[PDB]
Design a protein around this ligand. Structure first.
Ligand SMILES: *[C@@H]1O[C@H](CO)[C@@H](O)[C@H](O)[C@H]1NC(C)=O
Lengths: 97, 49, 46, 120
């Protein structure tokens, strides 16, 4: 999150997280992010779920294009730069930078 | 190697023999439980020269 | 014949819509689970 | 054809209250949704609250929930933001935006000079 350098939207950077413990309460209760959309699981009660792996795909866009990042949507960025699975189980976080 | 857990039990004992593997009793206690979940069928030891 | 990609070119005076936004998508993959949650505690009474 | 003017800002102590006004002029019938957003110097835009004029549904930023209340007066053609239990984080310029539809943050426009609120 606090990483200084982010790649382009078409060059979205992917990281793998495993063998650790994740506290999503701090992220959810931060107020510094204007985008908190969790699909598949509730935004809260994430502390009761344990998974094998976590994939973090980070990039930067302009505000007008923050809408297209969601299942079942269409748009320039989604279709040509970063397309996501329709039935993914995860959460998208974003904030003005 | 079970339930996708590699379980290593270890223990360790001063001996005064010359060439044999003592008799006796000693219960090994668990040391680690690696959650790896791979498919192990063969292994090898590796020792110094 | 046109170059496929274009530059946003962000400026300090950007509008709310055109202002830059950082986005991170966290996808959880489960098929032994390795990353678990925090599960709080209390005090002991005897 | 639509104008929004913000007023009611000022300097208050922590825990104080202010009541900010968004007066609309022109033919505002098309704009069903009205939102209040704020920007501090260093930081970017954020929407504190939004309201649907026809339905009455409202949305609030997690930080402001409980302390802020959004209301409208049809006769005044004004949307009001009530700030209670003001906090130093609340300090920034406040503006009201308006749009036909609520899917996106841009369709809101027509926001005025804004009002400064400082909590110290
Ligand atoms: C990352 O961002 C959060 C919220 O914007 C901030 O509170 C936190 O201090 C930052 N992390 C570091 C290591 O500075």
């Amino acid at each position: 999150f606090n990483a200084t350098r982010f790649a382009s939207v078409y060059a979205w950077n992917r990281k793998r997280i495993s063998n650790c413990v994740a506290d999503y309460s701090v992220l959810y209760n931060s107020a510094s992010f204007s985008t908190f959309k969790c699909y598949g699981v509730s935004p809260t009660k994430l502390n009761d779920l344990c998974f094998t792996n976590v994939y973090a795909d980070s990039f930067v866009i302009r505000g007008d294009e923050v809408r297209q990042i969601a299942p079942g949507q269409t748009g320039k960025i989604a279709d040509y730069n970063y397309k996501l699975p329709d039935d993914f189980t995860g959460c998208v976080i974003a904030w003005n930078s | 190697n079970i339930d996708g857990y590699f379980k290593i039990y270890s223990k360790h004992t001063p001996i005064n023999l010359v060439r044999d593997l003592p008799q006796g009793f000693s219960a090994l206690e668990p040391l680690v439980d690696l959650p790896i979940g791979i498919n192990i069928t063969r292994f090898q030891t590796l020792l110094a020269l | 014949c046109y170059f496929p990609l274009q530059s946003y070119g962000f400026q300090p005076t950007n509008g709310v819509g055109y202002q830059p936004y950082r986005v991170v998508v966290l996808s959880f993959e489960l098929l032994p689970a390795t990353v678990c949650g925090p599960k709080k505690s209390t005090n002991l009474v005897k | 054809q639509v104008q929004l003017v913000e007023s009611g800002g000022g300097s208050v102590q922590a825990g104080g209250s202010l009541r900010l006004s968004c007066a609309a002029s022109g033919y505002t019938i098309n704009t069903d949704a009205v939102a209040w957003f704020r920007q501090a110097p260093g930081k970017g835009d954020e929407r504190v609250a939004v309201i649907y004029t026809g339905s009455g549904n409202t949305n609030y930023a997690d930080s402001v929930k409980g302390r802020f209340t959004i209301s409208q007066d049809n006769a005044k053609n004004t949307v009001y933001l009530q700030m209670n239990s003001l906090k130093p984080e609340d300090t920034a310029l406040y503006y009201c935006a308006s749009g036909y539809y609520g899917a996106s943050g841009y369709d809101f426009n027509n926001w005025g000079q804004g009002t400064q609120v400082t909590v110290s």
